[PDB]
Amino acid sequence: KIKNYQTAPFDSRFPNQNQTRNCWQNYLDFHRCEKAMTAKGGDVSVCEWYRRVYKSLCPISWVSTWDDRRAEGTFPGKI
Template sequence: MVEDIKIKIKNYKTAPFNSRFPNQNQTRNCWQNYLDFYHCEKAMAAKGGDVSMCEWYRRVYKSLCPISWVSSWDDRQAESTFPGKI
């Protein structure tokens, strides 16, 4: 299973269709993948697992989200004022 995920990450080109977000506006998809990446990273680190498994979420949010949003969210996380639950 780990190898399958690593192959998918290696062959990744752009965010695939996600039935949770069927509309043209992908703002919520961007936000959810950003949160999912940090949830995954935190959970895998706590379990002592392979954090590279979370790379899929990072690639998806990087392809969907404007850079200015991501940098703003990263800054807010550093300041402990991030509104999302991670």
């Protein structure tokens, strides 16, 4: 499969104008996948897809604050 692409494709789970959760979900999925693969001595490249997608869709400010929070221990999502 390809970890190289054009842009986040259409996702039937988020078919409407409000794409807020698309960014959010893909951002979570990544860090959740990053943990497992980086913890159980596995392959972190499986998680690449999600990072591309969330990177494409998420505003820089959101990604920055969420990262600052994951480091601070105050990230509200469950990772």
